[PDB]
Design a binder for this molecule. Structure first.
Ligand SMILES: [Zn+2]
Ligand SMILES: [Zn+2]
Lengths: 66, 71
């Protein structure tokens, strides 16, 4: 009877549908958002920076590998 | 006067905190999160249902009750 459920690092709640593995954790596909505007990537692409998510523009606005 | 079912939390590890504002608790402790300031570290003012209070890494416990309950 070992555990068997991911937990959204956003609300620390047991996820149960589509999980997002980021920050070396798991996030509700609905709570995984940019770390600057909070825009969830339900079905979009996200960007990571310093260990934090960022939209395509905020990530870049924040850095953009440049 | 402050223990409504909002964010109850079950410990995941028997942590040890013995200071003025530190929370020492054995695993399996229902802690009533009194407050969750940022301050800087990330600790929370959580009372222990065992009837005690102290700061504790909000990552050493999980949350069961929640406010935003949509559907
Ligand atoms: Zn979540
Ligand atoms: Zn963003």
């Amino acid at each position: 009877g070992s555990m068997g459920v991911p937990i959204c690092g956003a609300c620390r709640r047991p996820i149960e549908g589509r999980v997002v593995n980021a920050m070396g954790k798991q996030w509700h596909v609905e709570h995984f958002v940019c770390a600057k505007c909070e825009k969830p990537f339900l079905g979009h692409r996200h960007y990571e920076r310093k260990g934090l998510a960022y939209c395509e523009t905020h990530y870049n606005q924040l850095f953009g590998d440049v | 006067q402050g223990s409504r079912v909002l964010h109850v939390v079950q410990t995941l590890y028997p942590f040890s905190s013995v200071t003025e504002e530190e929370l020492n608790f054995e695993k399996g402790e229902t802690m009533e999160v009194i407050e969750k300031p940022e301050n800087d570290p990330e600790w929370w003012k959580c009372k222990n249902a065992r009837g005690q209070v102290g700061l504790v890494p909000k990552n050493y416990v999980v949350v069961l009750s929640d406010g935003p309950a949509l559907h």
